[PDB]
């Protein structure tokens, strides 16, 4: 079972969410942060043919990078993960499934309260502006009938009132008003086009970024407001 460049980049991105991943047989990988602030799934091309839990995903991907892209990954007779190369064989340890904080089932996202779309260029420039203006918070809200992501710097502006960035996403035809706050430290999405679904019910809330391959559910901040 080879891991292509795209699957390896996807798993490298997943390693920034959870340090280790319990990846099961099939073409589906999902991960959840240890504190449960950001969940992610992906339907990937390379078929996985054995259940294994990796306690250190970043190290596993580094070891994979050490050998060529033609390396054949399998389950060794010992039980570990045997990466076979032209002349080298590497036995990455398999973790106990209970020591890797992973979802038991893919969480079924509810019907979205507000649906919009953020393009790859817009997401890239939002991240770059975040690096530049030092904003660590965003708020997806409604302004003059359009859904806007407002980038605030929470460190100097605790009340989230001084808007440092403002990106218009698309038209909002609904009649509800909301302000879904998302920590930018929770936006661990790989660059791409994301359909942004947002769901809220009382104190419950989430924001799903549906990508072409990977979907990222992100937990809203505690001081989010809405009327859904």
């Amino acid at each position: 079972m080879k891991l292509s460049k795209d699957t390896t980049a996807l798993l490298k991105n997943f390693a920034t969410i959870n340090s280790g991943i319990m990846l099961k047989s099939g073409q589906f990988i999902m991960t959840r942060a240890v504190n449960g602030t950001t969940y992610a799934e992906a339907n990937i091309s390379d078929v996985i043919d054995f259940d294994v839990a990796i306690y250190d995903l970043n190290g596993f991907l580094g070891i994979l990078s050490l050998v060529n892209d033609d390396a054949e990954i399998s389950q060794s007779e010992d039980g570990n993960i045997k990466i076979a190369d032209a002349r080298s064989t590497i036995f990455w340890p398999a973790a106990d499934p209970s020591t890797v904080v992973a979802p038991n089932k893919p969480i079924p996202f509810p019907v979205a309260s507000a649906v919009t779309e953020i393009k790859a260029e817009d997401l890239q420039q939002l991240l770059r502006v975040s690096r530049g203006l030092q904003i660590d918070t965003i708020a997806i809200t409604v302004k003059e009938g359009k859904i806007v992501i407002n980038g605030f710097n929470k460190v100097e502006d605790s009340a989230l009132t001084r808007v440092k960035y403002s990106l218009t996403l698309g038209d909002y035809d609904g009649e509800n008003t909301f302000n879904f706050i998302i920590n930018m430290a929770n936006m661990k999405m790989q660059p791409g086009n994301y359909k942004l679904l947002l769901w809220a019910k009382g104190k419950q809330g989430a924001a799903k970024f549906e990508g072409e391959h990977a979907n990222y559910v992100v937990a809203l901040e505690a001081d989010s407001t809405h009327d859904f």
Partner: protein, 319 residues
Amino acid sequence: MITVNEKEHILEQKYRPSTIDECILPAFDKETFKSITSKGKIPHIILHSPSPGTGKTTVAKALCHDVNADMMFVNGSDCKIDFVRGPLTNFASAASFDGRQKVIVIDEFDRSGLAESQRHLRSFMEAYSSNCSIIITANNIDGIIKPLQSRCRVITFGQPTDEDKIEMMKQMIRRLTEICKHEGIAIADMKVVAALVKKNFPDFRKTIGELDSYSSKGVLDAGILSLVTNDRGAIDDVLESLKNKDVKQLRALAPKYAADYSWFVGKLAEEIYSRVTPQSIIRMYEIVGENNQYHGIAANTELHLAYLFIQLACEMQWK
């Protein structure tokens, strides 16, 4: 006239004063904070007190609310050198169009590891004193470097005079009655609130926390009074056994402190030190040290502690 944060649910966080008039500060401290707010500009202040819950963070936020300051709240442990060079300089250098005074509240900034970070701040004030003012709330004043104390106005909390102690205890009893009438808690005995205030003074946060803890059923009766005023875990039984030379009581109590030997010995020495003659002080410390040194050698630790009790009760002469 009480301040309620409907968002919060911890009782000691729900009712946090939003203004200086609402606080339970001493007469002098409340007067100087009122003068600071009336003047309109906060100087560099260091609100410090070893006792937690005196009101330092409350007073800082209340000042920045009273003067309508452009408060920037910082966890002090996050005010590292990059924070001083980064967000802090960005905040001080930005333009205040509204005329609101820029105030940087560096809460709990008494960490020693941030020694270097403080030096820069001391340099920082020399370059951005006009732009922004700095309030540093701290517990261990020795953790703030001396130059910062020299530059800032140091205000010590939690050491009120006897008249101030009486007045603030009365004010805290009144505020706890208001809190109880606001939380739907019926006060059966009015002495329970006074006991709560007296026991936890000057820690007002602990006072509200104990009020919430003991108001489980919504009634504060004489049973609550017995619970508050009678401190379980103290050595009063052991102390009265020692003064009475109660052989039976000491013999019965010796296995009760068998597991927690070291802490009990420390507490016992600390308590007795203030209630004996100086010569008795030397003698008692000698016996306690000699017994504690052989803690890992003697076989029966319970009989060891009984021996300790016998010696302490015997060789001691209370003042």
